[PDB]
Amino acid sequence: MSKSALVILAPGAEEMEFIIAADVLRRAGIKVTVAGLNGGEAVKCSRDVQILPDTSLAQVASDKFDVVVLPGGLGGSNAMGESSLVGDLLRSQESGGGLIAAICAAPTVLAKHGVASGKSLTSYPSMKPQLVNNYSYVDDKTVVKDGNLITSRGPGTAYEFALKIAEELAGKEKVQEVAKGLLVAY
Amino acid sequence: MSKSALVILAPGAEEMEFIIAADVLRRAGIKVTVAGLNGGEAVKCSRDVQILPDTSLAQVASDKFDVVVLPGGLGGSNAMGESSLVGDLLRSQESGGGLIAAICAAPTVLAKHGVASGKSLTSYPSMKPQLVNNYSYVDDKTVVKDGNLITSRGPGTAYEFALKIAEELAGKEKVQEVAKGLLVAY
Secondary structure: OOOEEEEEEOOOOOHHHHHHHHHHHHHOOOEEEEEEOOOOOOEEOOOOOEEEOOEEOHHHOOOOOOEEEEOOOHHHHHHHHHOHHHHHHHHHHHHOOOEEEEEOOOHHHHHHOOOOOOOEEOOOHHHHHHHOOOOEEOOOOOEEEEOOEEEEOOHHHHHHHHHHHHHHHHOHHHHHHHHHHHOOOO | OOOEEEEEEOOOOOHHHHHHHHHHHHHOOOEEEEEEOOOOOOEEOOOOOEEEOOEEOHHHOOOOOOEEEEOOOHHHHHHHHOOHHHHHHHHHHHHOOOEEEEEOOOHHHHHHOOOOOOOEEOOOHHHHHHHOOOOEEOOOOOEEEEOOEEEEOOHHHHHHHHHHHHHHHHOHHHHHHHHHHHOOOO
16 A cells, blocks of 8 residues: 655764655655654754654664665764664564665665675765675666665765665656656656 | 855755755855744755754844855745745845845746846746746756856756856865765766
8 A cells, every 4th residue: 555664864964865865755655754863853964954853763663664764974874883773673674675775875884784795785985995895886886776775876876766766666657757757867 | 255155944845955955055165054934943844854944034134145045845935935034135135246046946936026037047847837927938958047046947956056056156176076075967
């Protein structure tokens, strides 16, 4: 009847990347929960934009989501990488064959929590040396999908990233109409 | 020696275009003030994302900004169009020789306030009929500049819109570095 997405909002997140994934997913008819990393309070992002989450990560820790989305930004990614809760939830998503999606610096969260080893991914270019030892790093793609893992490079790739997630959950036709309304070629 | 931008955040604002404007301008070293239309409280956006403004529009009313930026979204544009304070600041900005930038449905804000009549502009494609009478509408163009007016079309043109404003205020070398960091060709 419906597909869900958990979007984790962490202090120091790249707000553009975050907002694009939340907003595009909602456009495509997906039920998006924005879960604040440390609570239900406003999250101060990387360029000082403050965003109210829908709820806390902790409050949706017993729920299943068709996709777990990790926005990038160095500080948001560092916070998610240190969070034992993010680790538990990511291992859970991997073992239920659910989608994991990470953009920009956020794929280092996968490395930090031992998730999705041996898969192909990309990231923001400056994070590559953290991601070559246990993953096949892709240098030449804006978005990479390998089994249940979708990763992407940064702000210039965030619309394509969100649309690719949307396409897996909501289908081709829906995403075509969504992309048309965005004025995004896809 | 810095430059300044007022970004007006209004209820029903298209959050992506809003966040992209605030973030990209901040990356370019421009002092950004995010000012809530109706006060300093959180603003609910078109897709239910809630954003805390830096301050209220009312509180920056005697301030001079090098640019006044209007994000789009239909609810947001309609609210701005009804606001006498928006009108007053657009007119003052216009008399003052300062920059005005409006994306998506936001150009209709200038129509509602009788601002920049006869100027060349674009908008979200379906909003064209609202604009053809009193403006010189340009169909096939992502970002349109006429003197101190900059307009653009939608989410898919938001980066270029923001980078175009950034370039006017911060210069070519700065915006090239910012575009490089964003992974946006510009």
